[PDB]
Design an enzyme around this catalytic site. Sequence first.
Site, PDB file in Angstrom:
ATOM      1  N   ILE A  54       0.872  -1.194   0.000  1.00 52.06           N
ATOM      2  CA  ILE A  54       0.000   0.000   0.000  1.00 52.06           C
ATOM      3  C   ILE A  54       0.898   1.230   0.000  1.00 52.06           C
ATOM      4  CG2 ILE A  54      -1.544   1.348   1.406  1.00 52.06           C
ATOM      5  CD1 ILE A  54      -2.867  -1.380   2.192  1.00 52.06           C
ATOM      6  N   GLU A  60      -2.462  -8.764   2.984  1.00 46.23           N
ATOM      7  CA  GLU A  60      -1.986 -10.061   3.560  1.00 46.23           C
ATOM      8  C   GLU A  60      -2.970 -11.157   3.207  1.00 46.23           C
ATOM      9  OE1 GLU A  60       0.974 -10.219   4.231  1.00 46.23           O
ATOM     10  OE2 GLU A  60       1.655  -8.603   5.548  1.00 46.23           O
ATOM     11  N   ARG A  79      -2.348 -12.387  -0.204  1.00 43.59           N
ATOM     12  CA  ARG A  79      -1.122 -13.229  -0.308  1.00 43.59           C
ATOM     13  C   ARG A  79      -1.359 -14.620   0.264  1.00 43.59           C
ATOM     14  NH1 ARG A  79       1.773  -8.251   2.295  1.00 43.59           N
ATOM     15  NH2 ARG A  79       2.859  -7.269   0.544  1.00 43.59           N
TER      16      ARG A  79
HETATM   17  N1  LIG Z   1       2.565  -0.559   3.333  1.00 41.72           N
HETATM   18  C1  LIG Z   1       2.650  -1.981   3.413  1.00 41.72           C
HETATM   19  N2  LIG Z   1       3.642  -2.687   4.242  1.00 41.72           N
HETATM   20  C2  LIG Z   1       3.716  -4.171   4.313  1.00 41.72           C
HETATM   21  C3  LIG Z   1       2.806  -4.836   3.549  1.00 41.72           C
HETATM   22  N3  LIG Z   1       2.966  -6.168   3.700  1.00 41.72           N
HETATM   23  C4  LIG Z   1       3.985  -6.378   4.541  1.00 41.72           C
HETATM   24  N4  LIG Z   1       4.482  -5.165   4.947  1.00 41.72           N
HETATM   25  C5  LIG Z   1       5.472  -4.928   5.783  1.00 41.72           C
HETATM   26  O1  LIG Z   1       6.451  -3.844   5.405  1.00 41.72           O
HETATM   27  C6  LIG Z   1       7.652  -4.236   5.779  1.00 41.72           C
HETATM   28  C7  LIG Z   1       8.612  -4.266   4.637  1.00 41.72           C
HETATM   29  O2  LIG Z   1       9.765  -5.052   4.925  1.00 41.72           O
HETATM   30  P1  LIG Z   1      10.061  -6.458   4.222  1.00 41.72           P
HETATM   31  O3  LIG Z   1       8.859  -6.948   3.446  1.00 41.72           O
HETATM   32  O4  LIG Z   1      11.233  -6.328   3.276  1.00 41.72           O
HETATM   33  O5  LIG Z   1      10.400  -7.482   5.282  1.00 41.72           O
HETATM   34  C8  LIG Z   1       7.467  -5.761   6.398  1.00 41.72           C
HETATM   35  O6  LIG Z   1       7.238  -5.692   7.853  1.00 41.72           O
HETATM   36  C9  LIG Z   1       6.493  -6.186   5.767  1.00 41.72           C
HETATM   37  O7  LIG Z   1       5.981  -7.459   6.378  1.00 41.72           O
HETATM   38  C10 LIG Z   1       1.803  -4.134   2.687  1.00 41.72           C
HETATM   39  O8  LIG Z   1       1.095  -4.880   2.051  1.00 41.72           O
HETATM   40  N5  LIG Z   1       1.727  -2.716   2.615  1.00 41.72           N
END
Ligand SMILES: Nc1nc2c(ncn2[C@@H]2O[C@H](COP(=O)(O)O)[C@@H](O)[C@H]2O)c(=O)[nH]1
Length: 246
Positions: free
Chosen positions: A71, A160, A163
């Site tokens: 997002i 989520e 996914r």
């Molecule tokens: N804005 C946003 N952040 C998310 C989303 N899904 C997961 N995150 C979280 O944003 C962070 C990005 O770090 P990473 O995915 O590389 O571990 C994670 O904590 C991740 O799990 C999403 O769908 N939208």
Amino acid sequence: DVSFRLSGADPRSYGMFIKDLRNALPFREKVYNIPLLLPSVSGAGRYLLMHLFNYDGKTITVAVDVTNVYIMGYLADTTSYFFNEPAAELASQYVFRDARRKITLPYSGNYERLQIAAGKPREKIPIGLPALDSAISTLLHYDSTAAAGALLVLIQTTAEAARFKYIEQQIQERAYRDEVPSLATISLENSWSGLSKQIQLAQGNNGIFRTPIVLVDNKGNRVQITNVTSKVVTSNIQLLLNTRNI
Ligand SMILES: Nc1nc2c(ncn2[C@@H]2O[C@H](COP(=O)(O)O)[C@@H](O)[C@H]2O)c(=O)[nH]1
Ligand SMILES: *[C@@H]1O[C@H](CO)[C@@H](O)[C@H](O)[C@H]1NC(C)=O
């Protein structure tokens, strides 16, 4: 675009919205019958608009990056709101251009940053369809602390759930009663990147993960995922982050 109306929503309608959000994301191939999200999309085509309506019929439009289901920001009436990070700054060149003003939220969209702004971890924030009604209502008029918790709810109940079938089912169980996320919910959210990478590496390794991924299962027990015959791969995960973004 995709749309969801909480007025009249039930588990079946939410399930159909989540199916529709998944199907709005482009892919060139499947790996083990799971859509592989694209490495890159240039310009405005990178962003899906999700129109969300609360019980009372008030609405926000959410911008989602189709390469990673992140997002970027949202539009409430005449005001756009974007996370404080480069991908969301780029998105604001393409979406919500007609907003009268653009607010940059005082945090990125990262879970760790949102939990600090909200003042609580995901484990302690109830989620569900009522929580999504409350999150939409919160985001209609600016409040940066309240918005952080609202955004944690919005991310878990849309991205989520898209996914992971398990997380969709968890939100269906919370269609009329919010509850903090299960241990498995948190574990799958935290493991999406790692699972995506291992499933793509498995395709040239006979379905075997090069690095086993530890998850929490639906009974709250730690399990080691070692290969694509696991239920996480055959039934649960619904979208793969491209390894060119890992
Ligand atoms: N804005 C946003 N952040 C998310 C989303 N899904 C997961 N995150 C979280 O944003 C962070 C990005 O770090 P990473 O995915 O590389 O571990 C994670 O904590 C991740 O799990 C999403 O769908 N939208
Ligand atoms: C592959 O995964 C299945 C399902 O989780 C499991 O039962 C099996 O033992 C795994 N194979 C290994 C670790 O060689």
